[PDB]
Symmetry: D2
Subunit: 176 residues, 4 copies
Amino acid sequence: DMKHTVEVMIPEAEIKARIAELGRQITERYKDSGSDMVLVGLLRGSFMFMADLCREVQVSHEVDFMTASSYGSGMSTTRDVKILKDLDEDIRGKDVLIVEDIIDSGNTLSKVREILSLREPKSLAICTLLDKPSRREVNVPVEFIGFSIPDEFVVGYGIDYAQRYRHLPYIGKVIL
Amino acid sequence: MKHTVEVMIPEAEIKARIAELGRQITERYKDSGSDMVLVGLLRGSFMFMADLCREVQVSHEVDFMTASSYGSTRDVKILKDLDEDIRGKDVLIVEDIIDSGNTLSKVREILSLREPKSLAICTLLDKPSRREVNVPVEFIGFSIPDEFVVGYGIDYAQRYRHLPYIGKVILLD
Amino acid sequence: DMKHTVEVMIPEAEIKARIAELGRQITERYKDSGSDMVLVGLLRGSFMFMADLCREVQVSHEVDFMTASSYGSGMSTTRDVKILKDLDEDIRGKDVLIVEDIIDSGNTLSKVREILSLREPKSLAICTLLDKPSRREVNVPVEFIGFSIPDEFVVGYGIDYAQRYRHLPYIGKVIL
Amino acid sequence: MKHTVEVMIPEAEIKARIAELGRQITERYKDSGSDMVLVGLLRGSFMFMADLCREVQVSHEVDFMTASSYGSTRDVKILKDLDEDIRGKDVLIVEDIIDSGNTLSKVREILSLREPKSLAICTLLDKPSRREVNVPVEFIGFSIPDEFVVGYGIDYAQRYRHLPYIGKVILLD
Ligand SMILES: O=c1[nH]cnc2c1ncn2CC(COCP(=O)(O)O)COCP(=O)(O)O
Ligand SMILES: O=c1[nH]cnc2c1ncn2CC(COCP(=O)(O)O)COCP(=O)(O)O
Ligand SMILES: O=c1[nH]cnc2c1ncn2CC(COCP(=O)(O)O)COCP(=O)(O)O
Ligand SMILES: O=c1[nH]cnc2c1ncn2CC(COCP(=O)(O)O)COCP(=O)(O)O
Ligand SMILES: [Mg+2]
Ligand SMILES: [Mg+2]
Ligand SMILES: [Mg+2]
Ligand SMILES: [Mg+2]
Ligand SMILES: [Mg+2]
Ligand SMILES: [Mg+2]
């Protein structure tokens, strides 16, 4: 809780345009699979990205969600990744696309991929809106990236700052 | 069951209606002063929540619950509770369809125990005909007859959640 | 995490004897109900008490469990009581006995009773192994009490001290 | 289905067998030095856990999980995860019956990802005949034939969990 301002990093229109492209790419990849497809969102951060993204995915798919253990940025480095809420549906034999808002360290996401892989989906890929590779701690396969971004603390579009700013239609950055 | 899907409420009409809802919601809670939170019932309300919260011009938090779903006489149970506290906060439950009102009626009671400052419901679709339990609903996007609709988060055997419009399922025979 | 010792407060044999009595009383109360009965344990603390107690309850019943939000002793006074894991079964129209290890302030237990009451069981009662009334903050109906105890920090028999001592077969007290 | 319940494994034999199990478990982990935790799969293992941990003469934590149960080809899902971390700890999964081994096999894989120091399984009952997936089981209370048993945490349509013995259900006709 410290005095700050929020500057725009990615305007609403740019996000919309990029997600349209992501949609085309994801559609092109999975259109001929013939197996069931499901987009899996990591709550809470990816709810907005999921809503906009799945509307641009022109393939019959299911939408499902998952809540993994959060903790701080410092305790997440030393604590187990736990399932606070598992999927509602099966993914065995299905094309699964994990929908993430932002990959910073990539710790939690890495563990989540491992967990879902045990369920033997036909395929398992990740789509993140934002990637901050300067902050990457764990090597993790990421098939779709909306934006590779600077080393900034970002907010908006589902992403929060102490539970604040999730409803912003753009990606902003916190300036102390 | 062989079927098809026709547009009932176009994407453009949904967007317009939500913008209006956002203005109404903004107006009711603008001078509250207390923390505000929009609470979505998963999975159905995720898309409605995304668009709606972007039209609410009040600083608020977004949270989610998952209540037990059995289909069309069992206990309403919490599969996933809120992540944050709501005591002393303005709380708006965000729902996709109100039909029988059973689950939502119980979810409201459960949240009411936590003593929020206020507690209200916003639903995209309302089917007044199928109501079994009378539950107050302050904000309503559309009132429809007893039609089986899909899209915009609403599914049919897990299908069609990703449609940008509300559509009607036409059974073929 | 501070240097301490554990002294016995209620020896294993005394717990066994008292639970036998509790069993007789609970049996006498519910033997003629004719409706289904379920004992509901609040995890993790009441797992041992539940195992021993239900074996002394000579009435056909179901065993179910529930995990409510924990937090510290200081944050539990200002945070909502949340359901981390709800019951597996319905309780509507059933005789429900909530099985608790210890009632200190009684905050969390109070809220849990409220939540279960919404499901309209035929009856709803509470059985706690230990009651510490000197520390009671909220007035809550408690139908069965194993022991009313001094203002001591107790451990053992499911009850922990920073996750420690749950497996002790007796009730002990922490001495700094 | 009309039935009755006869004693198969008396309360006294269960107690004796568990005391022995406690000694074996105590011996294997006494000189480990790392934190130890017993992990029970709910609901079946709550009674077995209670008695077993009281016979384990090693300082340990007790925790629980609830995995998806569907009955006698779906994903194993976590309805309730551990409350505590297990990385670098000696972990003993405490189970009531091993039968097909399906759920337990998946639960072990999930916990294995968290990199505990060691990972083992203790089950009260083993039915080797019904095994579909080979999963290592270090400690076993009793090996039984393919019998439908109840009691000691094990249920039949939610019934008989509170029986202090293992019993067999006799169908009547
Ligand atoms: O710029 C950022 N903006 C808001 N959050 C960030 C940012 N960077 C890292 N975080 C924190 C987390 C998001 O979790 C938010 P929380 O659970 O509410 O504390 C990054 O996602 C997990 P990972 O680092 O493994 O990819
Ligand atoms: O047209 C419809 N299309 C798809 N479903 C419908 C429709 N109509 C009623 N449903 C079923 C349900 C949605 O079920 C919630 P879920 O099982 O968690 O996905 C409406 O809830 C009744 P209410 O909110 O009044 O208690
Ligand atoms: O003597 C005591 N011994 C161990 N614990 C105690 C005692 N006293 C109060 N506690 C803490 C809590 C138990 O929670 C343990 P936690 O979630 O792991 O921190 C008392 O139960 C809740 P309430 O106070 O509302 O009846
Ligand atoms: O004699 C039996 N009596 C009551 N049940 C039995 C028996 N035999 C196999 N079951 C069913 C199950 C118990 O189901 C766990 P739940 O649904 O969460 O309560 C044994 O699990 C098979 P495995 O552990 O090898 O994966
Ligand atoms: Mg996130
Ligand atoms: Mg955060
Ligand atoms: Mg709904
Ligand atoms: Mg407790
Ligand atoms: Mg504690
Ligand atoms: Mg089991």
